[PDB]
Design an enzyme around this catalytic site. Structure first.
Site, short mmCIF file in Angstrom:
data_model
loop_
_atom_site.label_atom_id
_atom_site.label_comp_id
_atom_site.label_asym_id
_atom_site.label_seq_id
_atom_site.Cartn_x
_atom_site.Cartn_y
_atom_site.Cartn_z
N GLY A 188 0.80 -1.21 0.00
CA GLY A 188 0.00 0.00 0.00
C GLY A 188 0.84 1.27 0.00
CE1 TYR A 219 -6.64 2.09 -1.16
CE2 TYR A 219 -7.95 2.10 0.85
CZ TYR A 219 -6.71 2.16 0.21
OH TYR A 219 -5.55 2.21 0.95
CG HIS A 245 -5.23 9.42 6.98
ND1 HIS A 245 -6.41 9.67 6.32
CD2 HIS A 245 -4.41 8.83 6.08
CE1 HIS A 245 -6.30 9.27 5.06
NE2 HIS A 245 -5.10 8.75 4.89
CD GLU A 293 -1.51 9.25 2.43
OE1 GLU A 293 -2.60 9.82 2.47
OE2 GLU A 293 -1.38 8.02 2.31
CG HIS A 304 -6.18 13.35 3.11
ND1 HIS A 304 -4.83 13.52 3.34
CD2 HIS A 304 -6.33 12.07 2.71
CE1 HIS A 304 -4.20 12.39 3.10
NE2 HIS A 304 -5.08 11.49 2.72
CB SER A 320 -4.38 5.07 -3.50
OG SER A 320 -4.63 4.23 -2.39
O1 OGA Z 1 -9.76 5.33 -0.42
C1 OGA Z 1 -9.80 5.81 0.71
O2 OGA Z 1 -10.81 5.52 1.55
C2 OGA Z 1 -8.71 6.74 1.18
N1 OGA Z 1 -7.66 6.91 0.09
C3 OGA Z 1 -6.56 7.86 0.53
O3 OGA Z 1 -6.60 8.38 1.64
C4 OGA Z 1 -5.42 8.13 -0.40
O4 OGA Z 1 -5.39 7.60 -1.50
O5 OGA Z 1 -4.42 8.97 -0.02
FE FE2 Z 2 -4.65 9.37 2.57
#
Ligand code: OGA
Ligand code: FE2
Ligand code: ZN
Lengths: 347, 5
Positions: free
Chosen positions: A169, A176, A187, A189, A275, A287
């Protein structure tokens, strides 16, 4: 205000539309959007040139296995909540899409985003949805070389290059699968890295973001609301269980901005950019994290969670040595008192 | 080391 602070002063979420030429060099385009002050907001949107696609179609993924889907139980009131992730037996995209579209977990009706948003914050503690999150793998086709989340070629690769260490990850892709009301808590990263998020298909994903410049104010507010959690782990927000509504943020003077990511769009979070958000309905996002030279200072100073023993930890040694040779000796002896300017770009 | 999820 030395020209660095005169760019994107309001620290608002910016959106970029790169030509196929700009889109080709990932690390270059990132440095560019930062030259435009995109990093101040902690979040930026990047719409790829219309003729760009990382996959033919997704009618084949109905079979894909979500080995560890999770049910999101939320407890809380008055804009402050704690999310508990309950793990459910494996399932396929079809079984997931089935439940996601069912009238039970289906997206409600609404007119303007403002209303869909009000419903989210009104009902997030009801009808615990299922989120097929953190699924190892990619949906990019082997030949796509532009913004391929599977091989971005940033200096984050040094972790693997130098040690062979794989961090699922973080330096590998994650998929997701979300449905209505599934959400991601406040949070930054791991190691305060950058993150890239591509929404392959489905309903939109909305984001909330706090400028890195004000990250600490969000942490202080969070600490006060959850003193129990703060004292058992300073970096408790990294547990990714804390939800805070925009109204609560507004009430306590914490600056933030919101944005909604549509299918075929990229979202980029910046070092120390807090975020959080939620999915509108059934969708699929991929991601991973990445780094740039500017990240190094953030990495050296990231406050990590110590109460759990499986948390992401990256040795900064290889980066300081290679990119900050003049400070390696000093840093090693813990005397590197570098203060971080969040508005500054890698000059 | 470590892992997301
Ligand atoms: O997919 C999600 O629930 C969250 N994804 C992220 O926080 C990201 O890609 O930085
Ligand atoms: Fe994130
Ligand atoms: Zn912890």
């Amino acid at each position: 205000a030395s020209e660095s602070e005169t760019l994107n002063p309001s620290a608002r979420i910016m959106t970029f539309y790169p030509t196929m030429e700009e889109f080709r060099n990932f690390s270059r385009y990132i440095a560019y959007i930062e030259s435009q002050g995109a990093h101040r907001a902690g979040l930026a949107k990047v719409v790829p040139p219309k003729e760009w696609k990382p996959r033919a179609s997704y009618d084949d993924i109905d079979d894909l296995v979500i080995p560890a889907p999770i049910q999101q139980l939320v407890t809380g009131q008055s804009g402050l909540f704690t999310q508990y992730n309950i793990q459910k037996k494996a399932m396929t995209v079809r079984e997931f899409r089935k439940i996601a579209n069912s009238d039970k977990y289906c997206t409600p009706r609404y007119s303007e985003f403002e209303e869909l948003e009000r419903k989210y914050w009104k009902n997030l503690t009801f009808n615990p949805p299922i989120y097929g999150a953190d699924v190892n793998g990619t949906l990019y086709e082997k030949h796509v070389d532009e913004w391929n989340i599977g091989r971005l070629r940033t200096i984050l690769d040094l972790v693997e290059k130098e040690s062979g260490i794989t961090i699922e990850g973080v330096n590998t892709p994650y998929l997701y699968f979300g449905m209505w009301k599934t959400s991601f808590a406040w949070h930054t990263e791991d190691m305060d890295l950058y993150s890239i998020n591509y929404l392959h298909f489905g309903e939109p994903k909305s984001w909330y973001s706090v400028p890195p410049e004000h990250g600490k104010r969000l942490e202080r507010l969070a600490k006060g609301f959850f003193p129990g959690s703060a004292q058992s782990c300073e970096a408790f927000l990294r547990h990714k269980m804390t939800l805070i509504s925009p109204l609560m943020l507004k009430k306590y003077g914490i600056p933030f901005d919101k944005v909604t990511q549509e299918a075929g769009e990229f979202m980029i979070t910046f070092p120390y950019g807090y975020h959080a958000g939620f999915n509108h309905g059934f969708n699929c996002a991929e991601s991973t994290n990445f780094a740039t030279r500017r990240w190094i200072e953030y990495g050296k100073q990231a406050v990590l969670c110590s109460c759990r023993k499986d948390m992401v930890k990256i040795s900064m040694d290889v980066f300081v040595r290679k990119f900050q040779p003049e400070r390696y000796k000093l840093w090693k002896a813990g005397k590197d008192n570098t203060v971080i300017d969040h508005t500054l770009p890698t000059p | 080391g470590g892992v997301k999820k």
